[PDB]
Amino acid sequence: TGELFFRSGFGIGMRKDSPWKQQVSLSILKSHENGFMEDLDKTWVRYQECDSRSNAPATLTFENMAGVFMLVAGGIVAGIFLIFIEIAYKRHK
């Protein structure tokens, strides 16, 4: 949550008297231009998994049918009982 602050990036640390310090910076600049740095982000960073967002409109699943389909299903088992009463009433009266 929130915004970013203190924007400093990542570097390579060497001593003030090094024969390698000038060549390292040039190689890093070259790697950003040709896309080698973007390749590393895909392999190690931006592969991702479960996604973002908070509103989340959601498809309705089976949980609603339990509170709905049970009545019609329960109506079937409660219908045969009324079947016998109705037909017998024709014979009885």
């Binding site: 602050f5 400093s8 231009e33 409109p57 309705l60 609603n64 389909f69 009545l71 219908g79 109705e86």
Partner: protein, 238 residues
């Protein structure tokens, strides 16, 4: 009969006779009433959370690399003599050759061409483009993705080679980050108005691209019905 009720009782049917059959129809009607109400309500909710998608994934999109084998081929360009042109030249020879006929001469000119439809995409510096996005009249101009940077770099101060001022200068620059003057300076100068957090204002007219699914379903239903009719006629013949 009992399939007619679920779809808002559209079709005409003939009523049954048994009392228990009447009870079954009456209890099925409730199910159908609740079933349809739930369907519409969800459908409205999905639309009020519709999210937009970028037309181009990035700089390596299909429309950018091979624009020819597309309809009214895509128009994009930049202002030459800069770092952006230098980078595209050394990495995409054919794309750079294609971009030659859409060269601009200014940022405002490029924005004007983009607003009037004379241009489909503009490629330029990331720092100045995000500024123009938030200062536009309205919020018509956006950057692909949520703000995406390719070949990341930064602005620096060019100094004479082998000078002694460089250590003092960059030590002073790092000191401004520690105190926090950079946030004050970006709030004072680089603040914007428009928000790019997927506003998703509104759709309109429900064009044919939306009804393609239902039309395809109707066509498939017609095809299967005619196939079954032909098969039934052939079977009745034998």
């Amino acid at each position: 009969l009992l399939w007619g009720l679920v779809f808002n009782n559209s079709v005409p049917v003939q009523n049954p006779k048994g009392t228990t059959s009447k009870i079954m129809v009456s209890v099925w009607a409730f199910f159908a009433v609740i079933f349809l109400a739930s369907y519409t309500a969800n459908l409205a909710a999905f639309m009020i959370q519709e999210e937009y998608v970028d037309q181009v994934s990035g700089l390596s999109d299909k429309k950018f690399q091979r624009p020819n084998d597309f309809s009214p081929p895509f128009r994009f360009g930049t202002v030459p003599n800069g770092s952006t042109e230098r980078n595209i030249r050394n990495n995409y020879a054919e794309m750079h050759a294609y971009m030659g006929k859409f060269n601009q001469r200014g940022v405002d000119d490029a924005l004007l061409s983009l607003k009037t439809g004379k241009l489909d995409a503009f490629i330029y510096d990331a720092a100045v483009l995000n500024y123009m996005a938030g200062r536009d009249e309205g919020c018509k101009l956006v950057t692909i993705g949520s703000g995406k940077v390719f070949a990341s770099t930064g602005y620096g101060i060019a100094i004479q080679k082998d000078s002694g001022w460089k250590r003092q200068v960059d030590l002073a620059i790092l000191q401004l980050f520690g105190d926090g003057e950079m946030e004050e300076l970006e709030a004072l100068w680089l603040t914007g108005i428009c928000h790019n957090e997927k506003n998703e204002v509104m759709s309109s007219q429900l064009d044919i691209d939306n009804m393609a699914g239902v039309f395809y379903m109707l066509g498939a239903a017609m095809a299967l019905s005619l196939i079954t009719f032909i098969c039934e006629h052939l079977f009745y013949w034998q």
